[PDB]
Amino acid sequence: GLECDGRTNLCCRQQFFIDFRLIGWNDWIIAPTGYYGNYCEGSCPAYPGSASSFHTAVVNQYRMRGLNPGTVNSCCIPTKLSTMSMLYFDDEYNIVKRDVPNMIVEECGCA
Amino acid sequence: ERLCAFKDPYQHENGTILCSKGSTCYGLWEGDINLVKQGCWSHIGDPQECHYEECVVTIQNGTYRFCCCSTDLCNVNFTENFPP
Known about the structure:
In chain A, about 15% of the residues lie in helices and about 40% in strands. By secondary structure, chain A is mainly beta. Chain B has one domain. Chain B has a three-stranded antiparallel beta sheet, with no helix packed on it. In chain B, a hairpin with a 5-residue loop joins strand 1 (about 25-30) and strand 2 (about 35-40). At the A-B interface, strand 5, strand 7 and strand 8 of A face strand 2 of B. Chain B: It comes from Homo sapiens (Human).
């Protein structure tokens, strides 16, 4: 997968820090102070093996004639997710540690 | 897997814990400084926080001290050493 470097506009994984300080949540979440949740950005192909190449010829013929075929483009989406440990306040002021799943995007890819 | 100190008064026979593969150790202390929680910290993906040979502490009360560290049982004592 691609990592966003700020140069390419292809489907890439951009690093994104979520600061609990900015959103005012450091009062009930003790740790971490924040995390690199990241996200997916960039362009994808139109979305196989041998039959999909036939659809390729049909699409190219329709576009060549000024018609529009199935413009079902792919999407830049997370393909690999990791869990994150969190240490925070419970609603009764007890200290609860919970590993919250699917919190950090580690790879992006096209749907 | 790593072995970490453990303590949870919220719902340790000998004081060991089997962490999932790739986790680290953490510890939370609270006035007169006594321990509130210790165990496995599976938050990687932010090595700004969990790259330590020993437990290191860096709106909040200002009383709490949280660390995470990489070795076995390192979350038993912490240290602060900022340059003046």
